[PDB]
């Protein structure tokens with residue numbers, strides 16, 4: 001028993017973290033095979049960030065201007081290119097620590113682990129969710145750009161996120177490993193604001209299932225509801241609309257607990273309408289939405 | 305910016321996780337040099353756990369009865385011994401992945417990362433605090449015993465905890481790496497209950513400092529207080545008594561924010577006496593105490 005915001009073991013990703021320097025800008029890069037992936041704003045100074053024309057800026061740069069360092073050893077850059085908002089530095093040595101990997105573009109509501117890095121060195125690992133507004137609520141400082149988000153399927157690392165920027169509002173924006181930003185964000189020093197941060201309803205429900213599995217069932221009531229009625233309540237509280245796909249995905253949790261999804265929805269509806277009244281669920285005084293139904297099942301079954 | 309319950313990168317500890325089987329009991333072991341450390345209840349069946357005489361139980365066991373497996377390779381056990389509540393299995397091969405390590409017995413209130421494991425395979429990593437009642441609020445299932453807690457100082461892993469048991473109340477008990485349990489817990493299937501779970505006041509204060517650093521200062525008031533007056537309030541709310549040592553340890557945080565410790569204490573006093581009134585601090589609706597002043601400083605400065 002017990003329920004924690006649990007990140008994947010980060011060792012396979014630590015083996016890929018390198019330091020990339022271009023001019024006076026130092027950030028993190030991901031070394032997989034003979035390619036180092038990093039944010040393209042490595043070629044900019046804080047002056048260039050106001051309005052950067054990256055194609056023109058990249059042209060004033062050559063292979064020898066990109067300093068890649070894996071630990072204390074210097075990598076030889078034999079090629080460079082811009083794929084959307086990431087630079088791909090071809091090095092002459094394949095990473096001996098490259099794990100089985102994939103680049104996947106995750107959907108909003110899905111979760112992933114972040115290995116926060118500075119100067120190509122890992123400092124910490126935490127669990128995150130891609131918000132419905134395509135931002136993440138991470139912990140990133142200056143020098144953290146190039147820190148990656150990932151998932152692990154037994155021995156295959158699915159790289160899903162690369163850190164690029166913090167918005168003036170304190171939330172984080174970044175790209176997938178092909179350089180495409182999640183959301184409408186651009187890698188420019190300009191006024192950019194995130195949309196409404198809605199709550200991932202299916203995840204809150206999965207976490208109510210985890211709470212019940214873990215002995216916390218004070219919030220369970222004698223009522224039920226319908227998808228349309230529950231969604232009328234969800235809409236008002238800025239919660240994501242719950243679909244039949246979400247009900248289906250909650251099936252394994254519903255089966256293990258013996259609680260129908262619409263019954264759990266009625267409990268959620270009363271928690272929204274009445275609050276927690278000073279009580280906690282899984283040691284939390286608010287409704288947690290950064291655990292997918294897959295995360296709950298994995299944690300409550302010991303998936304290694 | 306951003307503030308997360310951030311665990312240490314777990315790679316150095318993944319390289320040490322092995323599977324230990326004795327009879328039909330399978331748990332995790334820590335392989336450092338030519339020694340595998342694991343909980344001694346590996347020699348018990350669920351029948352023995354009612355009242356185990358471990359010396360007598362260990363005597364009916366020989367080196368060949370301890371099956372150690374590092375990944376898919378079998379380790380040869382050439383010696384075995386009982387140190388308090390841990391078995392130390394001498395193997396014929398030193399772990400090539402042994403990092404610089406120490407065994408440290410942490411103090412209540414201090415934090416550490418746990419690499420939860422099943423069958424010698426890591427499944428997740430999360431941050432924890434040793435509660436003032438010597439329990440931990442972890443996420444551990446059957447098969448997780450032998451999962452370790454650690455801290456990292458640049459390249460040295462300080463192993464501080466080994467998981468042994470879950471109490472009937474859902475919290476977790478375990479030992480340091482010398483086999484000594486934290487608290488009054490014994491490795492026996494008997495009625496054991498934890499004491500009062502008090503709140504780590506210095507950690508709540510460090511987290512209020514992190515909140516302020518990260519732009520959240522709604523809770524900051526025009527009042528101050530004294531150590532004795534603040535402690536009168538802390539006592540009633542089952543908060544740990546705040547000492548001058550705690551004030552000193554909060555010095556670096558107090559200096560960076562320009563907020564005196566006793567001023568932060570007065571804000572804490574009003575948060576205890578009045579509640580959060582539906583507001584959040586660092587996305588949390590309760591006072592977080594699982595971040596030491598060192599954790600806040602490290603996270604807010606990027607210690608790798």
Ligand SMILES: O=C(Nc1ccccc1NS(=O)(=O)c1ccc(F)cc1)[C@@H](O)c1cccnc1
Nearest residue numbers: 041049140141142164165166167168187188189
């Ligand atoms: O976004 C950051 N800073 C920042 C905050 C707010 C406005 C502007 C900047 N920096 S900037 O204009 O140079 C820039 C813009 C877009 C981009 F993709 C990278 C850099 C960046 O230094 C950072 C720090 C902390 C955690 N993550 C990222």
Ligand SMILES: O=C(Nc1ccccc1NS(=O)(=O)c1ccc(F)cc1)[C@@H](O)c1cccnc1
Nearest residue numbers: 345353444445446468469470471472491492493
């Ligand atoms: O403590 C556990 N189970 C349990 C729960 C409650 C009462 C008894 C037992 N198990 S027992 O009597 O066999 C035992 C007792 C002491 C001990 F150190 C190891 C095993 C153990 O299987 C476990 C599971 C889940 C997460 N951590 C540990």
Ligand SMILES: [Cl-]
Nearest residue numbers: 025044045046
């Ligand atoms: Cl820059």
Ligand SMILES: [Cl-]
Nearest residue numbers: 329348349350
């Ligand atoms: Cl057992």
